[PDB]
């Protein structure tokens, strides 16, 4: 029942020969505009334009002052004032860098996270609210307009180990987080407490006060489970009101909090139930930090493995067996595929590998 077909049009290696962990297409650019994506790995942040006939044009290369730094994630946004594109990067050093993609010059660096940062996500509605998951067991929500730490998610009922991923729902009402503690927790940010916290962070101004901004400390999630996976949870994304998550278990599980017919906004924080709806089976992805992704309209699901194969599913198919598309393979792609990014229109698919290579796959 899957329709989708791709073509490997191009591949290149970055001369640093260090693993590429993250890849992201800038989905903020408008129609007709160039299709730009960023790659992160080592102390490097490289930008690329996608052109006709599988041409991948190198634009700029940010090389971090810190040689020890190893970037793991990157998130695209824009300046709410100027409409100027903005890119946020983070890694091992646990420092969030806000880069001007046009000058490839850092504009601000947020510190606070006690350890490494594994994920970065911009709220789907507000371009200033940056979420970061950390090795320090907590989630930090930041206002990048007023340079404030809005909230710290964690504590008494937060993750008991390194948080590995997180995802906002389409509307930006809530976050689903996951980590080495095998759990998946839900944080509602549309609570009278959170919305007020966000509002307060916008009214905060240093040239009006001597006293610093007080972050909210959210010790209690609105849902928790360890009934989904038997090892670390390395990737989590929402599929509407449903969750898609994975472990080393060679499957992406589609589940939901509570009993099969319980509405997500009606489940109580003390809910013990969970409903496993389906599995996306694949192979040779028994290692950690392998991140699956989707296209804007959430019709496609891509995942890479340790041997350079690229699994794709058609999410519009109900049974996840018949949803399977042709595994994208290339006898020259044998390194582990850390992450993939579709272009906003789905015409391009990029994969990043451990051997410092980028692989381009154009839809037919």
């Amino acid at each position: 029942k899957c329709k989708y077909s791709f073509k490997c049009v191009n591949s290149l290696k970055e001369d640093h020969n260090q693993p590429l962990f993250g890849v992201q297409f800038n989905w903020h650019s408008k129609e007709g505009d160039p299709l730009v994506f960023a790659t992160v790995g080592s102390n490097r942040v490289t930008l690329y334009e996608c052109h006709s006939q599988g041409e991948i044009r190198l634009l700029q290369s940010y090389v971090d002052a810190d040689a020890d730094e190893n970037f793991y994630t990157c998130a695209w946004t824009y300046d709410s004032n100027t409409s100027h594109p903005l890119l946020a990067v983070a890694g091992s050093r646990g420092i969030i860098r806000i880069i001007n993609p046009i000058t490839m010059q850092c504009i601000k660096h947020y510190v606070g996270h006690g350890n490494a940062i594994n994920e970065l996500k911009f709220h789907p509605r507000d371009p200033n609210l940056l979420l970061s998951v950390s090795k320090d067991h907590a989630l930090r929500l930041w206002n990048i307009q007023t340079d404030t730490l809005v909230a710290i998610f964690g504590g008494v009922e937060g993750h008991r180990d390194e948080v590995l991923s997180a995802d906002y729902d389409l509307l930006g009402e809530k976050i689903m987080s996951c980590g080495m503690d095998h759990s998946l927790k839900l944080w509602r940010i549309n609570s009278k407490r959170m919305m007020n916290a966000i509002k307060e962070s916008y009214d905060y101004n240093p040239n009006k006060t001597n006293r610093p901004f007080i972050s909210q400390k959210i010790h209690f999630p609105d849902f928790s489970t360890r009934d989904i996976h038997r090892n670390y949870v390395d990737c989590v994304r929402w599929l509407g009101d449903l969750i898609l998550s994975k472990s080393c278990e060679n499957a992406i599980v589609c589940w939901k909090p509570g009993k099969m017919e319980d509405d997500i906004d009606k489940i109580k924080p003390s809910e013990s139930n969970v409903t496993i709806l389906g599995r996306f089976d694949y192979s040779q992805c028994d290692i950690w930090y392998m991140r699956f992704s989707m296209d804007f309209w959430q019709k496609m699901l891509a995942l890479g493995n340790q041997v350079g194969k690229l699994y794709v599913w058609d999410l519009e198919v109900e049974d996840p067996h018949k949803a399977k598309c042709t595994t994208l393979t290339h006898h020259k792609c044998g390194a582990a595929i850390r992450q993939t990014s579709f272009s906003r229109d789905s015409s391009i698919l990029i994969a990043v590998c451990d051997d410092a290579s980028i692989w381009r796959w154009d839809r037919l």
């Binding site: 800038n26 408008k30 505009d33 160039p34 100027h84 709806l277 959430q298």
Partner: peptide
């Protein structure tokens, strides 16, 4: 069905996000 109802939520919502994107001009890099 469960699936059909969830796919519609995806449509309605992603359209809200798309309509927000269309009403916006972001500078090329």
């Amino acid at each position: 069905s469960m699936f059909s109802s969830n796919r519609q939520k995806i449509l309605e919502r992603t359209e809200i996000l798309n309509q927000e994107w269309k009403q916006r001009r972001i500078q090329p890099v």
